[PDB]
């Protein structure tokens, strides 16, 4: 706890009756409080980064279960993530310095700014 | 006896039959100024005669509506007065008679229409 400075207190006021369904690699604890009441508020995630958290830290294995699109906890879709090309999540580093943010291939901030001139000069 | 036309603005007229007779007599008298061999004059004459007849025969506005099945006598008066306007307008900028050439192209297509589209009922 010790955060009376966030809405994280609203999540920690949840979890009082909720059951913990799995926890992904990053530490985000995925909770479920069904049966009681208030559909739409019976699946959430405790981000395990009580500060500096934001959305999109929820990996794709769980981002289904947590938006109610599926009923497969990330401990069940982890047997379906492709091993050959599977890639870990990236938290959406939007703005947090260059080389973390994404860059196109001509942005002059991207190492290896490609030239698009279709004609090959002499 | 009519309480009100559901339509807003079309105020209920108590003397519906009388003003209808007046308007249809005015229409029959004013339509004489258009050439006889024009579809407009045949139409005006025919339906004005039918409505003037049914208005003279029946007495109540309700019976006028019931026999002359054209909605409500207030809307009927609106139609008759608008028709008088049109006949007094048609006298001016007289469009009667077909000109010499008169190239009219009946592009009468007949595409089958699916009927789950609106059209009308």
């Amino acid at each position: 706890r010790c955060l009376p400075d966030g809405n994280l207190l609203q999540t920690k006021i949840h979890n009082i009756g909720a059951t913990l369904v799995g926890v992904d690699k990053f530490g985000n604890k995925y909770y479920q409080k069904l049966g009681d009441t208030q559909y739409g508020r019976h699946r959430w995630v405790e981000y395990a980064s009580k500060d500096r958290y934001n959305a999109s830290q929820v990996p794709a294995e769980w981002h289904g279960w947590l938006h109610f699109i599926t009923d497969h906890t990330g401990d069940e879709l982890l047997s379906l993530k492709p091993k050959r090309y599977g890639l870990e999540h990236k938290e959406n580093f939007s703005g947090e310095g260059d080389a973390y943010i994404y860059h196109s291939k001509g942005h002059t901030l991207n190492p290896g700014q490609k030239n698009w001139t279709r004609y090959q000069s002499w | 006896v009519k309480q009100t036309t559901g339509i807003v603005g079309l105020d209920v007229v108590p003397n519906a039959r009388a003003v209808l007779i007046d308007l249809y007599s005015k229409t029959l008298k004013e339509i004489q100024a258009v050439p006889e061999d024009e579809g407009y004059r045949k139409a005006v004459e025919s339906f004005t005669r039918q409505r003037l007849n049914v208005c003279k025969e029946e007495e109540d506005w309700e019976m006028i509506e019931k026999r002359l099945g054209c909605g409500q006598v207030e809307e009927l008066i609106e139609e008759a007065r608008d028709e008088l306007t049109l006949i007094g307008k048609m006298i001016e900028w007289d469009p009667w008679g077909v000109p010499d050439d008169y190239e009219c192209e009946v592009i009468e297509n007949d595409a089958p229409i699916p009927k789950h589209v609106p059209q009308h009922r």
Binding site: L8, G40, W44, V45, A55, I69, T70, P82, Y102 | -
Partner: protein, 177 residues
């Protein structure tokens, strides 16, 4: 006429113990105390709200969010460069340039969806023959700068490999439609 309409609409409610009913329902504001009572019932009822970052709104496997170029289970980008999505795109966001790679099988040298110039209508997901381009349920990719929001040629749309675990699920559940 409005004068007579008023006279009659006030001669409709003109019998004692009806004038009294209307007077005690316009003096002891009674229509309004049924407003306050309902408002109170809702002041005490549970709240339909969602503390967002921790729990998010319900979606569906058909939900159209961040576009992701899928891959075949054995690597090999699924995107053969037919350009059907570049054609079907209403906003013309996708710019595809194709080159026979050295292996010999066609592939897109440039597959750049411009997310800002993109309407998220899912036409690309429908038009693509092999399900190469699909919309990942991400929808959380607000970018500090516009240039990042233009998704590069097959490199950032290739981040769908992370979302494949959810995209493959949504496709396995939607393909029945």
């Amino acid at each position: 006429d409005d004068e007579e309409a008023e006279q009659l609409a006030k001669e409709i409610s003109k019998d004692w113990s009806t004038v009294f009913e209307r007077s005690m329902n316009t003096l002891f504001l009674t229509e309004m105390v049924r407003g306050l009572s309902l408002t109170l019932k809702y002041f005490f009822d549970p709240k339909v709200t969602i503390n967002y970052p921790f729990e998010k709104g319900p979606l569906s496997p058909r939900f159209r969010g961040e576009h992701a170029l899928r891959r075949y289970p054995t690597g090999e980008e699924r995107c053969i460069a037919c350009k059907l999505c570049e054609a079907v795109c209403p906003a013309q966001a996708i710019t595809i340039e194709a080159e026979e790679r050295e292996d010999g099988s066609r592939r897109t040298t440039r597959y750049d969806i411009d997310m800002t110039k993109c309407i998220y209508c899912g036409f690309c997901q429908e038009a693509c023959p092999v399900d190469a381009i699909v919309e990942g349920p991400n929808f959380e990719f607000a970018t500090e700068t516009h240039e990042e929001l233009l998704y590069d040629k097959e490199k950032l749309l290739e981040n769908g490999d992370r979302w494949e675990t959810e995209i493959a699920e949504n496709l396995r559940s939607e393909s029945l439609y």
